[PDB]
Design a protein around this ligand. Structure first.
Ligand SMILES: *[C@@H]1O[C@H](CO)[C@@H](O[C@@H]2O[C@H](CO)[C@@H](O)[C@H](O)[C@H]2NC(C)=O)[C@H](O)[C@H]1NC(C)=O
Lengths: 111, 49
């Protein structure tokens, strides 16, 4: 019951980029939040957004996101050169089998 | 008869002492022929109640 996710996206420095994470009624349905995570190349990873509306400390304000029923999406306003990393969308499932299910993963390219 | 009358001497006559009953020979169990498993784990697990 893995979550669907587009392979990768490209963008240019200075303007907004957007990514999406889509699932089904069993995983994202019935009012289940989606969280996001990072993957720096060869570095211990870090959180981006939890609860789909809140935001932790130590993260730039240029990140935002929201969900539309079956799908969810996030936007970065003004991507920079340090955004070269891997992004993960994580949700839960109806049963205890899928307490933690992650997506395949998406990557961004500057310029 | 001696046990029923609780004595060692039985007088002339006809007495009732016990009851004869035929015992069953084998057991026959019949149930419907269904195979679907009840989804107990669907309700007994569940993330939120
Ligand atoms: C709730 O989930 C647990 C697993 O976390 C289920 O327990 C398993 O049940 C199966 C089927 O009987 C067994 O083969 C496993 O060995 C059990 N594992 C554990 C952790 O005991 C449990 O059956 C589910 N709900 C119910 C129906 O009680």
């Amino acid at each position: 019951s893995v979550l669907t996710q587009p392979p990768s996206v490209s963008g240019a420095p200075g303007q907004r980029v957007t990514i999406s994470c889509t699932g089904s009624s069993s995983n994202i349905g019935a009012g289940f939040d989606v969280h996001w995570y990072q993957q720096l190349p060869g570095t211990a990873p870090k959180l981006l957004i939890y609860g789909n509306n809140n935001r932790p400390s130590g993260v730039p304000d240029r990140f935002s996101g929201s969900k539309s029923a079956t799908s969810a999406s996030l936007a970065i306003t003004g991507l920079q050169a340090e955004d070269e990393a891997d992004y993960y969308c994580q949700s839960s499932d109806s049963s205890l089998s899928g307490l933690y299910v992650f997506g395949t993963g998406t990557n961004v390219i500057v310029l | 008869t001696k046990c029923t009358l609780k004595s060692f001497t039985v007088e002339k006559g006809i007495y009732q002492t016990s009851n004869f009953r035929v015992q069953p020979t084998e057991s026959i169990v019949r149930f419907p022929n269904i195979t679907n498993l009840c989804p107990f784990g669907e309700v007994f697990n569940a993330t939120r109640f």
